[PDB]
Ligand binder design. Structure first.
Ligand SMILES: Nc1ncnc2c1ncn2[C@@H]1O[C@H](COP(=O)(O)OP(=O)(O)OP(O)(O)=S)[C@@H](O)[C@H]1O
Ligand SMILES: Nc1ncnc2c1ncn2[C@@H]1O[C@H](COP(=O)(O)OP(=O)(O)OP(O)(O)=S)[C@@H](O)[C@H]1O
Ligand SMILES: Nc1ncnc2c1ncn2[C@@H]1O[C@H](COP(=O)(O)OP(=O)(O)OP(O)(O)=S)[C@@H](O)[C@H]1O
Ligand SMILES: Nc1ncnc2c1ncn2[C@@H]1O[C@H](COP(=O)(O)OP(=O)(O)OP(O)(O)=S)[C@@H](O)[C@H]1O
Ligand SMILES: Nc1ncnc2c1ncn2[C@@H]1O[C@H](COP(=O)(O)OP(=O)(O)OP(O)(O)=S)[C@@H](O)[C@H]1O
Ligand SMILES: [Mg+2]
Ligand SMILES: [Mg+2]
Ligand SMILES: [Mg+2]
Ligand SMILES: [Mg+2]
Lengths: 456, 276, 215, 64, 149, 74
């Protein structure tokens, strides 16, 4: 028995017998790697590595379920999975030697029981945990036991916290084996959601349809760039379910999710108009040229091209890989083209200020490009990020006006090239911003003066 | 050939699988070829490590590759390659970087090593490095004969590459390939490919399309412009196919679940609608 | 109540709302609806209120507390307690090792045993790195386990720029909150707001405030 | 030796020193061996002799 | 001759064994020569302390050599080069492609070539007096290519 | 507490640490540094590693209950 550990740590095996843990689907290769590492002789300590939300804690829960379901090899058929929050270990160790004694006792109990697999989730907390002006931290206490195979210790951490925290301590790094948890594919995410579905139906008291699963996975993969697949698809299903619950419950009975209940949520998150085209919106889109001519007289060809690009995006025929449109407006001074960009922004958002504006006449020096993407690592203001990247990331469905393009240094537009072709710009932190839902309008008056000072 | 040499184990241990400069006119599949290689090796284009060199217009941007010096606020490439040592690295449009950013590439190309500002060495020895460029393409149109092909284009592009990059950089690249300008037959095949990919994108919307060979040939002749390669074909597809379908599906959704056939009657495109 | 330490670190907004001292919240029905939708989620049911300075985020959380008192929220919330927790209060008087981790662990246990508490952490960007660094474990790392499996219903508010600077540096913490965008209200909305607040200022300044003064 | 001499002239380029020899070794020797070894593992355990006949390189396979 | 002169005991105690700039056309084994020397002296190429100067293009990157400036975050760690040399004082040091470094880096090298000492930013002094310092370059190759006759 | 005995020769104290933790912790206390003699354990060669693995082999075979061939070591 393990009387200290039992008070410090959650027993995942008993919780899996109880049955509250959500089911784990498809991750058999990762579970197999975990079993292989745990069956090692000397350093049987797997650490699950990956992005936030990819399912690492779900892998440890699925291992506890596999042990409970006796799907594991004989060496594991009676093992206890104990989830040790280092916060609980540090808590209350006011006096010298209290933390060291407590953790030594825990290690002794693990050794004497022999049937415990420890799970230190958030493993990056282990470095320096419990250190002080003269304390010995958890990592330096555990180092001997981790390298003699006495402890079996699963951990999980993000890739960034792995690098930042526990690749500093090169002696601790050696003691753990990284199991790479990749982001699951679209079809894997569909299977995951179908497996989870019953748990969410029982909470929200609604039927969750298969085509809603397919919609939520496809849409959240296409339009949610900050987050990784299974977490964000679950998020989108869970909020669509909560929304339809809330709406039906406050004044048939077998209410069911749908693709439109999902489109409403993703349009709420992103602002991109993804909900089904109702007749009012369609009549407004078809009369778009008339609405633009309320502010721009003439210039019919430009209005037509802009309106056709807007229709082409709203229909859904736009290539996903490219911005809605990129346009150069070119002509004499005082002739509608900036006014047309503002009229478009108003027709799309009800205000001119919703337009992102970049006056290129202040990019006359090449090094001004740092305004769009930020200062390189190590230079003053690197923390502040790029102004255009942040503005587009904050509102991904927006009109961007690059005004008076010929006045910028010729090289500065080389930054646009990837925006126009891929619809990507990389922030100097390394974050990728997607312009795939922006309209990009560039205005110029090159040649227009020469057309007057030409005298044959 | 380079990929086979790598898989055969003949590849020199001390060097990357390959380093290639893809040089040519604009709009010729060289960045598309890099993405196609990434897909063929890893099943998706997203698996490519990509570095868009136009971000590096100024020398000090090199700190993105290897990190900020010790103690200064805050490497991206080193971390990505250390995370996936078997990968395709694309340095797209190299000539738009500051000329001497690629001084950092030299050790990568010779040793297959790059050092990280933490003092850590990352081995590119199992990566493929691809560098797209279009030096000389501007000079090819500045040039006009005050006087009365392929090999001359190849030679003048290679000379402009010799001008733009230091000799000890070009000496380390395993191959320097110049891309041919596309022929009209090739453009017709590209139109067929694009129309296929449009059709099987639309099909999962439940919009079923077919395009007749006459229509595709009319699109291929509308989009023909030799100095711009395949890109003007995309604009032709947008104008002809996509605009009219967008008008139809917005104007009362009169297309959902039906079949649309696009053909050109000799005067104009027609958009007949029928059931399956 | 049965939560004797939390009641000493936090302010019960629900009772302060029932005392009528919180100013009324007008027109923000869509943001309130979004907050209710997030709180009714199964798992990561934590909204974070995101916007510019002075757009009215804390006023959203107070409007929620008043909605609780008026029982016009769904039955799933009809008796919840909204507890505003100042992180600077939790770190007060905690010199020794483990004293902050113990305090916040006991707070969490009290939350879990009561189950009828919604935690409100205004200025959520203070949560990361709170609790010191010399062998301490900071509040974000202590709360991350609970925040991802539904034990804590937590409402945050922070500015866009402090969200970018602090939360998105720890992308594992970012995943656990859902951004509710608190837009700036329109002119006519601000007119309605000011005509709603009028009574509270007339009583304090002991003067009439004309409509055209609002306009 | 005739193969080595042919490699040494196909890789000759005086402005670039020795490095174009490496590219020549890769193109001539390593391409064709990689074809042979991937096309049915027919090289493994056997001896290969490389020579040049004045038209092309030849790759003859024999037992030890 | 420099190796043999140092091993005979005739080297000036105050100076490193040798400092050499290898210069010339590209692809002429001046890096390979340093590698071969390292192998001949230690039995493997990896014993060479290799520094790739093409990372030191910006002025402040010299912190990698001698540590972060006083009061900066890493100031107690010392330099990477200083500690690699202090750990192995008999070693070949290769400064590949020196001319690509920022000029400020050579001011640090001056005291190394003058006294065989490098002061780490901590103030600790590292003795280079038993190292061989090889610097390679190909300055003028672009001037060579634009020599038209 | 231990500085007197370590300098007198009262304790025959073997220790071990990495290069980084030596430099970071116990080279700061230069008086303590003086009291220890560093023995640099170099990384073994490839052939030495083969010898080490052939020596350890029995202990891993008996754990995994499999035979481990020499060419698997190589
Ligand atoms: N294979 C899977 N089967 C079922 N649910 C899964 C699977 N992978 C992920 N999930 C769900 O994804 C959600 C988040 O997964 P977690 O494992 O809790 O996140 P995480 O990877 O631990 O992120 P952090 O940053 O490390 S806390 C949970 O609701 C899981 O149920
Ligand atoms: N065709 C037009 N229809 C309606 N208003 C117009 C038109 N052309 C110009 N204006 C008005 O004239 C003013 C200036 O128009 P602009 O669009 O700024 O001129 P401009 O062509 O943008 O000048 P440049 O090229 O940027 S120097 C605005 O108040 C517009 O409303
Ligand atoms: N030879 C080709 N075969 C097939 N598709 C092609 C070809 N050339 C161009 N394309 C298509 O045309 C578009 C642009 O091709 P790219 O390869 O990006 O041109 P590019 O010259 O490589 O771009 P750069 O290097 O950045 S100027 C893509 O949609 C390609 O699929
Ligand atoms: N919808 C609203 N209804 C009633 N009063 C409102 C509303 N929006 C704002 N207010 C009032 O306007 C002021 C807004 O203050 P806050 O709500 O604290 O704004 P804030 O964005 O929370 O500022 P921070 O971020 O906490 S410094 C208060 O005096 C509110 O009473
Ligand atoms: N003179 C030479 N003798 C023998 N091998 C050589 C010679 N020159 C080049 N090589 C070989 O060709 C390759 C390139 O040689 P390097 O020595 O790297 O050229 P390098 O000029 O020293 O490098 P630089 O100056 O930094 S461009 C290596 O594989 C060498 O083994
Ligand atoms: Mg976890
Ligand atoms: Mg390219
Ligand atoms: Mg507030
Ligand atoms: Mg060299």
């Amino acid at each position: 028995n393990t009387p200290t550990l039992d008070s410090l740590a959650r027993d995942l095996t008993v919780i899996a017998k109880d049955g509250t843990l959500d089911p784990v689907i498809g991750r058999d290769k990762e579970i197999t790697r975990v079993i292989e590492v745990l069956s090692r002789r000397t350093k049987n300590n797997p650490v699950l590595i990956g992005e936030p939300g990819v399912g690492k804690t779900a892998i440890a829960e699925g291992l506890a379920q596999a042990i409970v379901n006796n799907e594991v090899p004989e060496t594991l058929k009676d093992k206890r999975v104990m989830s040790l929050d280092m916060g609980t270990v540090v808590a209350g160790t006011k006096y010298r030697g209290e933390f060291e004694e407590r953790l030594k006792k825990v290690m002794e109990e693990i050794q004497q029981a022999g049937n415990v697999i420890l799970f230190i989730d958030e493993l990056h907390t282990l470095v320096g945990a419990g250190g002080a002006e003269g304390a010995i931290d958890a990592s330096n206490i555990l180092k001997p036991a981790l390298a003699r195979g006495e402890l079996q210790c699963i951990g999980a951490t993000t890739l960034d916290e792995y690098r930042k925290n526990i690749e500093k301590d090169a002696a601790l790094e050696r003691r753990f084996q990284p199991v790479q948890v990749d982001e699951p594919s679209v079809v894997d995410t569909v299977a995951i959601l179908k497996g989870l579905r019953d748990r969410y139906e029982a909470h929200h008291r609604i039927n969750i349809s298969d085509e809603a699963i397919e919609a939520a996975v496809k849409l959240s993969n296409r339009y949610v760039s900050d987050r990784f697949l299974p977490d964000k698809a679950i998020d989108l299903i869970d909020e669509a379910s909560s929304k339809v619950r809330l709406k039906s419950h406050t004044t048939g009975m077998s209410t069911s999710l749908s693709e439109e209940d999902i489109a409403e949520v993703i349009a709420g998150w992103t602002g991109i108009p993804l909900t089904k085209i109702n007749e009012t919106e369609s009549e407004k889109l078809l009369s778009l040229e008339d609405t633009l001519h309320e502010r721009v007289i003439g210039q019919k060809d430009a209005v037509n091209s802009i309106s056709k690009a807007v229709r082409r995006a709203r229909a859904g025929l736009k290539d996903p890989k490219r911005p809605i449109g990129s346009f150069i407006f070119l002509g004499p001074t005082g002739v509608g083209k900036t006014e047309l960009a503002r009229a478009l922004a108003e027709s799309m958002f009800g205000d001119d200020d919703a337009m992102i504006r970049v006056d290129m006449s202040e990019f006359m020096e090449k090094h001004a490009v740092s305004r769009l993407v930020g200062a390189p690592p190590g230079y003053v203001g690197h923390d502040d990020g790029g102004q255009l990247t942040e503005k587009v990331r904050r509102k991904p469905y927006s009109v961007i006006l690059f005004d008076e393009i010929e006045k910028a240094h010729p090289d500065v537009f080389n930054i646009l090239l990837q925006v126009l072709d891929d619809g990507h710009l990389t922030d100097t932190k390394g974050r990728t911003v997607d312009f795939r839902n922006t309209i990009i309008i560039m205005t110029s008056n090159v040649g227009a003066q020469e057309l007057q000072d030409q005298r044959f | 050939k380079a990929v086979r040499r790598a898989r055969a184990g003949l590849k020199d241990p001390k060097r990357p699988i390959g380093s290639f400069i893809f040089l040519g006119p604009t709009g010729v599949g060289k960045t598309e070829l890099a993405r196609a290689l990434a897909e063929s090796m890893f099943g998706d284009d997203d698996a490519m490590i990509r570095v868009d060199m136009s971000e590096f217009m100024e020398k000090h941007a090199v700190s993105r590759l290897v990190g900020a010096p010790p103690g200064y606020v805050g490497g991206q490439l080193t971390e990505k390659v250390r995370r996936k040592p078997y990968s395709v690295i694309l340095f797209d449009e190299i000539e738009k970087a500051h000329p001497d950013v690629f001084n950092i590439l030299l050790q990568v190309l010779d040793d297959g090593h790059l050092t990280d500002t933490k003092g850590r060495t990352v081995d590119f020895r199992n990566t493929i490095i691809i560098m797209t460029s279009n030096v000389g393409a501007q000079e090819l149109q500045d040039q006009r004969f005050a006087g009365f092909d392929y090999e001359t284009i190849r030679k003048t592009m290679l000379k402009e590459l010799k001008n733009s990059f230091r000799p000890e950089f070009l000496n380390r690249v395993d191959d320097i390939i110049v891309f041919h300008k596309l022929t009209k037959e090739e453009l017709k095949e590209i139109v067929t490919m694009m129309v296929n990919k449009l059709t099987n994108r639309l099909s999962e919307q439940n919009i079923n399309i077919i395009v007749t060979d006459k229509a595709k040939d009319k699109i291929a002749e509308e989009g023909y412009d030799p100095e711009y390669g395949a890109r003007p074909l995309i604009r032709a597809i947008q104008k002809t196919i996509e605009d009219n379908l967008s008008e139809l599906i917005l104007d009362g959704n009169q297309i959902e679940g039906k079949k649309v056939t696009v053909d050109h009657d000799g005067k104009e495109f027609k958009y007949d609608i029928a059931e399956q | 109540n049965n939560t004797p330490t939390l009641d000493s670190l936090a302010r019960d907004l629900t009772v302060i709302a029932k005392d009528g001292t919180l100013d009324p919240v007008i027109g923000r029905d869509k943001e309130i609806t979004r907050v209710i939708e997030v709180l009714s989620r199964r798992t990561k049911n934590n909204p974070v209120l995101i916007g510019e300075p002075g757009v009215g985020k804390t006023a959203i959380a107070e409007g929620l507390a008043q909605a609780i008192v008026n029982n016009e929220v769904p039955e799933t919330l009809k008796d919840k307690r909204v507890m505003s927790l100042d992180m600077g209060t939790v770190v007060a008087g905690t010199k020794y090792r483990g004293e902050f981790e113990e305090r916040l662990k006991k707070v969490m246990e009290e939350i879990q045993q009561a189950g009828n508490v919604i935690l409100f952490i205004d200025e959520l960007h203070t949560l990361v790195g709170a609790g010191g660094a010399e062998g301490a474990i900071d509040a974000s790392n202590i709360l991350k386990p609970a925040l991802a499996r539904g034990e804590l219903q937590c409402i945050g508010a922070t500015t866009l720029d402090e969200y970018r600077k602090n939360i998105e540096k720890d992308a594992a913490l970012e995943r656990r909150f859902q951004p509710v965008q608190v837009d700036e209200p329109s002119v006519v909305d601000t007119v309605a707001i000011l005509k709603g607040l009028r009574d509270r200022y007339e009583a304090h300044h002991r003067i009439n405030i004309s409509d055209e003064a609002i306009e």
